[PDB]
PDB file of C-alpha atoms and ligand atoms in Angstrom:
ATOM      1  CA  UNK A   1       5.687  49.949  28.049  1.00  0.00           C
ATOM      2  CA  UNK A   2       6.268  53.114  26.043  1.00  0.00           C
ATOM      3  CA  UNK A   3       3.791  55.826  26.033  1.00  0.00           C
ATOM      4  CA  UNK A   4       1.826  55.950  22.494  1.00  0.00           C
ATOM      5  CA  UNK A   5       3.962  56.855  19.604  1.00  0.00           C
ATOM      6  CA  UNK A   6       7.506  56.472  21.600  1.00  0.00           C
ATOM      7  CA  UNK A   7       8.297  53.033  21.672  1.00  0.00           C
ATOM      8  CA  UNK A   8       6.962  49.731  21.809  1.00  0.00           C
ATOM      9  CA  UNK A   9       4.791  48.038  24.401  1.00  0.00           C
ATOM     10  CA  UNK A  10       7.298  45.395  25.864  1.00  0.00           C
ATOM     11  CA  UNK A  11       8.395  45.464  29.599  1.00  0.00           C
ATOM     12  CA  UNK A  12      12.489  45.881  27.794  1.00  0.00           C
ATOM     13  CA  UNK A  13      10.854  48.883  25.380  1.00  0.00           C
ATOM     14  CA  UNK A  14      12.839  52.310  25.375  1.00  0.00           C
ATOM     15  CA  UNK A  15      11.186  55.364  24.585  1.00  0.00           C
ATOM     16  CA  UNK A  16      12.219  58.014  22.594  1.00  0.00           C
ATOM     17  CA  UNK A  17      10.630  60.870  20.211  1.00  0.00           C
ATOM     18  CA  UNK A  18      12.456  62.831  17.233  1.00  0.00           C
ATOM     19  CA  UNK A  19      11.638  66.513  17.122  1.00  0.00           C
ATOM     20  CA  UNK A  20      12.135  67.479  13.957  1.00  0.00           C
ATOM     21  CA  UNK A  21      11.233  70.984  13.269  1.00  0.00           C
ATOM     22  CA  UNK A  22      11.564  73.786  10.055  1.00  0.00           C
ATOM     23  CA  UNK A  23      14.073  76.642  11.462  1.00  0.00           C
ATOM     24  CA  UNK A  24      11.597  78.681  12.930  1.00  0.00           C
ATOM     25  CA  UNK A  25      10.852  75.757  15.248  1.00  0.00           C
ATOM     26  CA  UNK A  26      14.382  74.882  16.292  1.00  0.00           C
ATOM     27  CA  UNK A  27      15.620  75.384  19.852  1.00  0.00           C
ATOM     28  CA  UNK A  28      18.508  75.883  21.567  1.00  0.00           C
ATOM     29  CA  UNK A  29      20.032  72.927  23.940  1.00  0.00           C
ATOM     30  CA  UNK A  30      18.781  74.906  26.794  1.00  0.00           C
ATOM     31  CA  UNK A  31      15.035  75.313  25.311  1.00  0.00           C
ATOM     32  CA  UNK A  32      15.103  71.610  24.367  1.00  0.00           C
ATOM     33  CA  UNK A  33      16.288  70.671  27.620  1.00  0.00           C
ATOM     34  CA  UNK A  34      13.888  72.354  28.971  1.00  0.00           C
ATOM     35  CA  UNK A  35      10.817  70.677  27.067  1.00  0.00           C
ATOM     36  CA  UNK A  36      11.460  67.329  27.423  1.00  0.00           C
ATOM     37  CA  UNK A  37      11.446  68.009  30.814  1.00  0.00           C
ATOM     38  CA  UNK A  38       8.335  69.679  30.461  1.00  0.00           C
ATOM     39  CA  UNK A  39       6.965  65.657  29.904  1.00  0.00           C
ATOM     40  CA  UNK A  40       8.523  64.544  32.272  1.00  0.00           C
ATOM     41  CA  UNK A  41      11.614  63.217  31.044  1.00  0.00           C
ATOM     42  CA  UNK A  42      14.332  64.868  29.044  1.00  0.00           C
ATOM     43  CA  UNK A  43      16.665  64.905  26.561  1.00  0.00           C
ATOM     44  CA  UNK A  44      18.012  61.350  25.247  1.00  0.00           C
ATOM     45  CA  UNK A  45      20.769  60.021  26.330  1.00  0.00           C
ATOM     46  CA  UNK A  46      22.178  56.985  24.660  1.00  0.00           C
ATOM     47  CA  UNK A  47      23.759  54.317  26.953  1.00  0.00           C
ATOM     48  CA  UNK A  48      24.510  51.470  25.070  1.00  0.00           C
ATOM     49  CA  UNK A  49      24.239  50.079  21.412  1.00  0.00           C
ATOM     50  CA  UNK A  50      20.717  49.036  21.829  1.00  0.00           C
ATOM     51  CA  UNK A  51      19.549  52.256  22.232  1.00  0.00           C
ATOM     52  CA  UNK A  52      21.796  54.140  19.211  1.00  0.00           C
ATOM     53  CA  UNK A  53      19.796  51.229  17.466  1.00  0.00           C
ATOM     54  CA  UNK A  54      16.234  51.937  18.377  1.00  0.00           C
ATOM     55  CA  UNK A  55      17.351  56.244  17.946  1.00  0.00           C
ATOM     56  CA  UNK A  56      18.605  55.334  14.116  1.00  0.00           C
ATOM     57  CA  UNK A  57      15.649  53.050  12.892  1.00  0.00           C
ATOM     58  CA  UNK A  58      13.121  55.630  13.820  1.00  0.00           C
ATOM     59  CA  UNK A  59      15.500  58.339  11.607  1.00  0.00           C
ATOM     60  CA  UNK A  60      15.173  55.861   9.180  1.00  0.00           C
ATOM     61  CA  UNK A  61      11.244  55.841   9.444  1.00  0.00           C
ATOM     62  CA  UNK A  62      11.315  59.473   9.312  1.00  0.00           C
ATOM     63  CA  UNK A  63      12.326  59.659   5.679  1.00  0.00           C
ATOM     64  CA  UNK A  64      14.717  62.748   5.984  1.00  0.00           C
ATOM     65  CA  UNK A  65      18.258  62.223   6.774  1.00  0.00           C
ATOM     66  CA  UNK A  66      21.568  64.276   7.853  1.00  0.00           C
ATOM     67  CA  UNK A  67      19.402  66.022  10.844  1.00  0.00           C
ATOM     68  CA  UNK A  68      21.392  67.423  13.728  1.00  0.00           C
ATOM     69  CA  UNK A  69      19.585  66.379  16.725  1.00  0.00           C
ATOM     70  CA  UNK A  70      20.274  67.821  20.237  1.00  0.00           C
ATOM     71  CA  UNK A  71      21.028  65.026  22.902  1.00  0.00           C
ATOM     72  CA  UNK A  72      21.610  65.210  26.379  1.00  0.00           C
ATOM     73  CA  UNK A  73      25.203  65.970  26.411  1.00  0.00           C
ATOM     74  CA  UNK A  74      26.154  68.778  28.447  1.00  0.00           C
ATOM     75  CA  UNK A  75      30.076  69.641  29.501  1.00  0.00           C
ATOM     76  CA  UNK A  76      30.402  69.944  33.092  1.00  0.00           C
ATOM     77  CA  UNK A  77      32.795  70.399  35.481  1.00  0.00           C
ATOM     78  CA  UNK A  78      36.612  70.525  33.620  1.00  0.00           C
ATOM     79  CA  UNK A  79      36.838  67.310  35.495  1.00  0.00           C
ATOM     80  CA  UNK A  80      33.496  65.885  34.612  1.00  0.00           C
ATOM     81  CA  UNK A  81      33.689  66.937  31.490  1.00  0.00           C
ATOM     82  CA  UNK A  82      30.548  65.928  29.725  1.00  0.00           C
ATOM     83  CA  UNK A  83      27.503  64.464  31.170  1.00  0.00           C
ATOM     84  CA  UNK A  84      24.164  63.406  30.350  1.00  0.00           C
ATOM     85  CA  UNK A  85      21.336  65.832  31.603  1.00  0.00           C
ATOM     86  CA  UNK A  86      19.464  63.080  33.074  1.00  0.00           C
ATOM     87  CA  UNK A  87      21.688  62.040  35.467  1.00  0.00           C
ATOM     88  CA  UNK A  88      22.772  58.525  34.231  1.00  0.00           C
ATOM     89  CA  UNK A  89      26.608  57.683  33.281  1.00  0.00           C
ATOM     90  CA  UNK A  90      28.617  58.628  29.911  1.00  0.00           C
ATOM     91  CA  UNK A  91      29.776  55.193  29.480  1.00  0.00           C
ATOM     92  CA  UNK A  92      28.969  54.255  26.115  1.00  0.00           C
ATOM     93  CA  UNK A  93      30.456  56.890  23.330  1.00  0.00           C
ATOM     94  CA  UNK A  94      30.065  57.457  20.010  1.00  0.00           C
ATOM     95  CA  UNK A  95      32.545  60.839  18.931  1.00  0.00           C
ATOM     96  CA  UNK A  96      33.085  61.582  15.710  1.00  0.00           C
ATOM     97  CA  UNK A  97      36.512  61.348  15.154  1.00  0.00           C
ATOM     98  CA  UNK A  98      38.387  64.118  16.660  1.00  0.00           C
ATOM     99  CA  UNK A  99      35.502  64.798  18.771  1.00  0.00           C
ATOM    100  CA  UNK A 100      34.690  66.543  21.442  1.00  0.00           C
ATOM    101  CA  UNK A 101      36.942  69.476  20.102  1.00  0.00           C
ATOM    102  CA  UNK A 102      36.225  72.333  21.804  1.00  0.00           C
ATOM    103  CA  UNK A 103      36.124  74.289  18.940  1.00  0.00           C
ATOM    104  CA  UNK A 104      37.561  77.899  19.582  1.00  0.00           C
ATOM    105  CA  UNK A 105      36.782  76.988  23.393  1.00  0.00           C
ATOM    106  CA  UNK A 106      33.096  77.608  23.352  1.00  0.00           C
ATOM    107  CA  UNK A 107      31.661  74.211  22.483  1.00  0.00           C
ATOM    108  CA  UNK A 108      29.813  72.882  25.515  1.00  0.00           C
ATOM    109  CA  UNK A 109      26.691  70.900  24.343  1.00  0.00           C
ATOM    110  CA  UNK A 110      26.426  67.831  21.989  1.00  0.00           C
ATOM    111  CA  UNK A 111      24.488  67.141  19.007  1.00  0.00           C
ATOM    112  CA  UNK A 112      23.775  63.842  16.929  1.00  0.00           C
ATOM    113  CA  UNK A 113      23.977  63.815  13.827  1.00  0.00           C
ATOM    114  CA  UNK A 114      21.456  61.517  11.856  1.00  0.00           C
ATOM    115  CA  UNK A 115      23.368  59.528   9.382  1.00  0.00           C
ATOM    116  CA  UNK A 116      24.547  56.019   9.463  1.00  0.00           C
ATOM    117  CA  UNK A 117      27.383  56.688  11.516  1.00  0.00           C
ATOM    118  CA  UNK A 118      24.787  58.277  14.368  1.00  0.00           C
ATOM    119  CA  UNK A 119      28.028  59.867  15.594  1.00  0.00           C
ATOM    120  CA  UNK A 120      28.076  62.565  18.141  1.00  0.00           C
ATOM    121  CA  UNK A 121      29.553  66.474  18.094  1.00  0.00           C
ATOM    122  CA  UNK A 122      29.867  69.099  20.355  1.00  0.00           C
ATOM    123  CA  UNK A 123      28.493  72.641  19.061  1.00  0.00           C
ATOM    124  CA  UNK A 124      27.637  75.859  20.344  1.00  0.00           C
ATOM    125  CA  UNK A 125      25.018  75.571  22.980  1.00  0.00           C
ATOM    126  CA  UNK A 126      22.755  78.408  21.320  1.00  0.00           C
ATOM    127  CA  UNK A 127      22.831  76.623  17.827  1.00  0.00           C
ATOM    128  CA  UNK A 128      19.386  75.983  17.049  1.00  0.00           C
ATOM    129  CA  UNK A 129      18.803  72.495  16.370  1.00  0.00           C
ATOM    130  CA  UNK A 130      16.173  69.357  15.997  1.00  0.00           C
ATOM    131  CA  UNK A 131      16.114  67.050  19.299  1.00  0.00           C
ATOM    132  CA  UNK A 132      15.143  63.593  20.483  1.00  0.00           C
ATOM    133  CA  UNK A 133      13.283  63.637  23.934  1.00  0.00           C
ATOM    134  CA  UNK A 134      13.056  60.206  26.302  1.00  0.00           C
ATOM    135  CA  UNK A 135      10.880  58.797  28.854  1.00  0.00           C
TER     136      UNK A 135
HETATM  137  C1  LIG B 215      34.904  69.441  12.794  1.00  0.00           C
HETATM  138  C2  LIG B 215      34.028  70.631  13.171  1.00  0.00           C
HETATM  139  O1  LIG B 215      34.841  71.788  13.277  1.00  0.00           O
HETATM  140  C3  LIG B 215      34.094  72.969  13.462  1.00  0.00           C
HETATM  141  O2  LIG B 215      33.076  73.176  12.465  1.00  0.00           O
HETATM  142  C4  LIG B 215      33.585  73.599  11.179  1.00  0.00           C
HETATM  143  C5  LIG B 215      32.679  73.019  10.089  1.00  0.00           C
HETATM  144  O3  LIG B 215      32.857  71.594  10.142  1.00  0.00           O
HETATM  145  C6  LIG B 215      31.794  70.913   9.524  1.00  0.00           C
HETATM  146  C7  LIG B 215      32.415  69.978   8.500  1.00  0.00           C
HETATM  147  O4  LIG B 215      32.975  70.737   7.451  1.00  0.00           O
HETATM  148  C8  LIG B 215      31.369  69.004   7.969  1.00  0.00           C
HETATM  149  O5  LIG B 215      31.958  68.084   7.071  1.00  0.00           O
HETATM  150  C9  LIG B 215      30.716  68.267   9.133  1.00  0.00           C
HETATM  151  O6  LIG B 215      29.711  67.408   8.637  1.00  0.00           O
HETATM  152  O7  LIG B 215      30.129  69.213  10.002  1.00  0.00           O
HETATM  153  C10 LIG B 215      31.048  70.114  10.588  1.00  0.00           C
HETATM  154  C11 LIG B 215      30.291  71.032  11.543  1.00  0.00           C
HETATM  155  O8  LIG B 215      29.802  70.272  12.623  1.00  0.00           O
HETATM  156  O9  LIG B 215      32.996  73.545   8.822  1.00  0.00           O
HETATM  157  C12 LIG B 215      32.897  74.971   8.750  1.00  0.00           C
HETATM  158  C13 LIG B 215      33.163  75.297   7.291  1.00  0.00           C
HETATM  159  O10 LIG B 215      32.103  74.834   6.477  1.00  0.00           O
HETATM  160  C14 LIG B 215      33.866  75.638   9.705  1.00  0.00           C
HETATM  161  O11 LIG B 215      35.200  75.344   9.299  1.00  0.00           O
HETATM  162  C15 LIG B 215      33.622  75.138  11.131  1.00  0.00           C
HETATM  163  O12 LIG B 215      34.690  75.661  11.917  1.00  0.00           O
HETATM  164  C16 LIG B 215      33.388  72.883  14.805  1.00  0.00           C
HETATM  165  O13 LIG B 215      32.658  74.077  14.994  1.00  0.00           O
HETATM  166  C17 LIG B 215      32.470  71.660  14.825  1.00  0.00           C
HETATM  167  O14 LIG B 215      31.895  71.469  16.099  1.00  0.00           O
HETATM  168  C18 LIG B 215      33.246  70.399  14.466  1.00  0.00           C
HETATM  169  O15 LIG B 215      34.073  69.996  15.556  1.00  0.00           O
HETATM  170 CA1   CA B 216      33.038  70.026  17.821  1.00  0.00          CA
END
């Protein structure tokens, strides 16, 4: 079951939270990193279909659309190259198309953006952006 206000109450439930905030409010990848952990989880990370499902109904509950959204994705090791924050597998993708780019070599974090398409970019780390937390 999903704590109040994440998710719903089933055994199956997953939990996530939007975070979206005016710019004075935004954080970097680092700083919203950092506060999901502060509950106890972390950024989302977005393993399968199911869960880019649950992550795009409650954008469309929100009302507002074309948000970036931090996830978990963080570049690694060269070899790695990127990972979730929380530890679990990048299996399931979702790129834009021609992404991740590197972008003049200095893009190292990945952000969602919240349109139909729920596709994925990587950006500048420091980029102040929205974010979705898990549990
Ligand atoms: C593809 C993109 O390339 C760099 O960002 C450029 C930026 O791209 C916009 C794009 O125009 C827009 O349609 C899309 O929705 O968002 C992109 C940004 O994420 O456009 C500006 C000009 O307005 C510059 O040309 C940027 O270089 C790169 O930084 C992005 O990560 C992304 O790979
Ligand atoms: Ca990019």
């Amino acid at each position: 079951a999903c704590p109040e206000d994440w998710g719903a109450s089933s055994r199956t439930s997953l939990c996530f939270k939007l975070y979206a905030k005016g710019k004075h409010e935004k954080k970097t990848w680092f700083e919203s990193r950092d506060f999901c952990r502060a509950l106890g989880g972390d950024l989302a990370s977005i393993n399968n279909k199911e869960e880019q499902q649950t992550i795009w109904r409650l954008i469309t509950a929100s009302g507002s659309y074309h948000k970036l959204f931090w996830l978990g994705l963080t570049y690694g090791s060269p070899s790695e190259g990127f990972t979730w924050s929380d530890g679990s597998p990048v299996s399931y993708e979702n790129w834009a198309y021609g992404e991740p780019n590197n972008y003049q070599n200095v893009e190292y974090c990945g952000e969602l953006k919240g349109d139909p398409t729920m596709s994925w970019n990587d950006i500048n780390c420091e980029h102040l952006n929205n974010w979705i937390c898990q549990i």
